[PDB]
Amino acid sequence: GQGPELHLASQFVNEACRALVFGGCVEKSSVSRNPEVPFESSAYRISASARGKELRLILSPLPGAQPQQEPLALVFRFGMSGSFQLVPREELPRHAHLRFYTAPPGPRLALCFVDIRRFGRWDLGGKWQPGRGPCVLQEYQQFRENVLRNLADKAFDRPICEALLDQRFFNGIGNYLRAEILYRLKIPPFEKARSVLEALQNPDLLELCHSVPKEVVQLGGKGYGEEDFAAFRAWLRCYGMPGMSSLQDRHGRTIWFQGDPGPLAP
DNA sequence: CGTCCAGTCTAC
DNA sequence: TAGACCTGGACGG
């Protein structure tokens, strides 16, 4: 997932879990190299928030719950294929790598972090990743200022299409988003980032870093629901669209665009 | 059957 | 940085 997917995932967890009580342990799959979640309570609620490309689950025991302990926070990064599902306890999907089980009684459900490729990671501790910039979705003015106020930084030496993936400044922006954002302003992807952003001292390039992902959020769903996917493929104008160019950036990631590749092309 | 394609993280 | 980390779907034979 990118910003939209992480945000929609957070809304999914909060709606799904609003009226559920969890109890017992936090089960990890045998295959997962992420840490055991050292947490057990007779009764806890789960809530989520997203910030950029990270999602924070908070495990909050009910007053009286045993053992007495304080809330525990986990941050997830999804990598290529992470997601959350609320499933029947005895019908876990494949690659359900972390599972929270609803308490005795009630219909026995499991909230599962599902990650086919296992590129996703989780950390004990609620801290956002130090060095990630503010969320392009929920912290727009802070994100905007964090870029224009630090254009001297060497990150802006790189092609704009590469800078847009630097989560220190574009926390939430990933591959389809950079293609879709640049196509809307017909900016060559290998224009120098500083050159494009100097200008901004018309929805402009930093506004699109906010408004474009917000469009994806308003599409809704996307595993949070199959025509959900069709609605997305329809929304796309550039990424993987017939008649568009593609190149490799210097980290081997495919940028989609129309026309002028731009000066710093390989 | 095979090939090729789809975001960190970390060792050097 | 260059390579590591994984599965599954879309292809072509």
UniProtKB/Swiss-Prot annotation:
The gene is NEIL1. Changing residue 53 to L: Loss of glycosylase activity. DNA binds at residue 175. One of its GO terms (cellular component) is nucleoplasm. Its EC number is 3.2.2.-, 4.2.99.18. Involved in base excision repair of DNA damaged by oxidation or by mutagenic agents. Acts as a DNA glycosylase that recognizes and removes damaged bases. Has a preference for oxidized pyrimidines, such as thymine glycol, formamidopyrimidine (Fapy) and 5-hydroxyuracil. Has marginal activity towards 8-oxoguanine. Has AP (apurinic/apyrimidinic) lyase activity and introduces nicks in the DNA strand. Cleaves the DNA backbone by beta-delta elimination to generate a single-strand break at the site of the removed base with both 3'- and 5'-phosphates. Belongs to the FPG family. Ubiquitous. It catalyses: 2'-deoxyribonucleotide-(2'-deoxyribose 5'-phosphate)-2'-deoxyribonucleotide-DNA = a 3'-end 2'-deoxyribonucleotide-(2,3-dehydro-2,3-deoxyribose 5'-phosphate)-DNA + a 5'-end 5'-phospho-2'-deoxyribonucleoside-DNA + H(+). The keyword DNA repair applies. The keyword Hydrolase applies. GO terms for biological process: base-excision repair; base-excision repair, gap-filling; depyrimidination; negative regulation of nuclease activity; response to oxidative stress. One of its GO terms (molecular function) is damaged DNA binding. Induction: Up-regulated during S-phase. This is Endonuclease 8-like 1. The chain holds residues 2 to 290 of 390 of the full protein. Keywords: Chromosome, Cytoplasm, Cytoskeleton, DNA damage, DNA repair, DNA-binding, Glycosidase, Hydrolase, Lyase, Multifunctional enzyme, Nucleus. It comes from Homo sapiens (Human).
